[PDB]
Structure 1
Amino acid sequence: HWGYGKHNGPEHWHKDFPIAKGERQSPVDIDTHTAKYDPSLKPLSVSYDQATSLRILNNGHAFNVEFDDSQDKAVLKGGPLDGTYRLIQFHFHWGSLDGQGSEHTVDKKKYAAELHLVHWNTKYGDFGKAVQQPDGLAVLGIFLKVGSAKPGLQKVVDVLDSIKTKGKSADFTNFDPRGLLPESLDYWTYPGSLTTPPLLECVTWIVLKEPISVSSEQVLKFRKLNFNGEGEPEELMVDNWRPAQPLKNRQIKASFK
């Protein structure tokens, strides 16, 4: 099926998913001098105090930390958003090398990885209905650079051994996603899509200006994961990122000057 390899990667997706060539595809390059400061954007409201993590899953192209989204426990509000978006999961995209890995780029700069905290619009009842709507998802994107370790990431790092291959999951309770945030919530925002198939154009992207730092040791443990299932030939889970797509008729807005 689809993947990130030579023969099934981003340049092939349009054959099964024609929206790959659509008008609001993600990710994009964030040109910081062309993005417009909008003083009518509110501050982001990240309310994760009551978040309930449940499990961590290797789904064959990332690892997802999944949350209980049956109540308003961990919600995103404010910023460019109308209404309330519930946290369902977060995951990362990363490279085979420190100089690549992020999906979004900032003046063509690639970060070593990118964190996606995925939220769905409560007005649509559940995630599956939300992805069918132009304003169904809000994804908080956070760049990772390599330097100092991120203490709040280490618990994630230490469980990756137990979900090395596709389809493996592990209990993963009492994880606080607030430990993955930078100090500043300054952000860029633009309307976009899922960055993996089905590539639905359902996402309000909110990309934080300030990266978090992770250690070389932490990112190396991401790269020990496998795209394949157990007992299948070992293909390291690396470079699970889609390149920047054409901006077309879209304007990136900044919450800061």
Structure 2
Amino acid sequence: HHWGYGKHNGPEHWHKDFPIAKGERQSPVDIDTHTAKYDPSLKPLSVSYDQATSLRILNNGHAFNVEFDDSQDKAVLKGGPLDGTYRLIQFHFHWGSLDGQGSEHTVDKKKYAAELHLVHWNTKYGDFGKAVQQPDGLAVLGIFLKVGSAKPGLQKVVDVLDSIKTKGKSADFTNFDPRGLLPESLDYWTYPGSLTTPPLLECVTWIVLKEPISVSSEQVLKFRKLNFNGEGEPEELMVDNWRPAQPLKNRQIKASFK
């Protein structure tokens, strides 16, 4: 009886195996745009993905991960609210059964159709498993998806999903350039938070971009053909794999922009 996103094992149940679910710095949160304060001391983000080395795509039963070679400083996030160098390890998405829901973060209680998470770990901790034990271990770059025009840089991901329909399937996925998933503006909000799935560790500096990317209805419909189940199990579509907004508690969301 493992955690997931159903009635019997969804987000309102996670606290029984992961008591940190009710902690002081949980994610995601609603971003109240009027309460977020401009912080003129924040730096522009530095997103250096020119040497990124993608390797593989995996259906893990909760989402799909595009995994990178993080054994060297090849794709790094720096600047903004961050001290030091954070290395890209993987990206994944969260999405809905309908275009009106799917994002984890919300903006003035608005839900987007999906949310991209580019996951990075602080190189001062040596690898990912050590970094998730530290309050500044991870930096996750969050990017909203709205349905409209296609995102051409997403289509190579969409077209491999048929080969990883079910939990535990993986496929070669080399030479994918994550720069094709970024919006024009790197304006962001930032706050201290957590992983949004178990183990819900409070190890993340969240950096959420204000500008969403547009994807087509056909692109998101292909996300919704994935399965949570393994091969030869009753089909359960991989939809609504998002955690809802958690209490902000004693936190301030900072804006990089006016």
TM-score, normalised relative to structure 2: 1.00
Q: Which residue of 1 aligns with 2:50?
A: 49
Structure 1 residue 98, shift from structure 2 partner: 0.1
Structure 1 residue 91, shift from structure 2 partner: 0.2
Structure 1 residue 149, shift from structure 2 partner: 0.1
For 1:133, what is the secondary structure of its paired residue? Answer: coil
Residues 120-169 of structure 1 show CA distances to partners (whole Å, capped at 9, x for unaligned) of 00000000000000000000000000000000000000000000000000
Matched residue pairs, number? 257
CA distance in 2, matches of 1:17, 1:248: 19
Moved over 6 A (4+): none
Taking the TM superposition and a 5 Å limit, the aligned residue runs for 1:167-246 are 167-246=168-247
Residues 61-104 of structure 1 show CA distances to partners (whole Å, capped at 9, x for unaligned) of 10000000000000000000000000000000000000000000
CA distance in 1, matches of 2:206, 2:78: 13
For 2:115, what is the secondary structure of its paired residue? Answer: strand
CA distance in 2, matches of 1:201, 1:109: 24
Structure 1 residue 175, shift from structure 2 partner: 0.2
For 1:162, what is the secondary structure of its paired residue? Answer: helix
Identity level (%): 100
**RMSD, matched Cα:** 0.2
Q: Which residue of 2 aligns with 1:254?
A: 255
Residues 160-190 of structure 1 show CA distances to partners (whole Å, capped at 9, x for unaligned) of 0000000000000000000000000000000
Structure 1 residue 193, shift from structure 2 partner: 0.1
For 1:14, what is the secondary structure of its paired residue? Answer: helix
Residues 50-71 of structure 1 show CA distances to partners (whole Å, capped at 9, x for unaligned) of 0000000000010000000000
The alignment status of 1:110 with 2:111, answered yes or no, reads yes
Consecutive unaligned residues in structure 1, runs of 5 or more? none
Structure 1 residue 247, shift from structure 2 partner: 0.1
Residues 220-251 of structure 1 show CA distances to partners (whole Å, capped at 9, x for unaligned) of 00000000000000000000000000000000
Q: Which residue of 2 aligns with 1:145?
A: 146
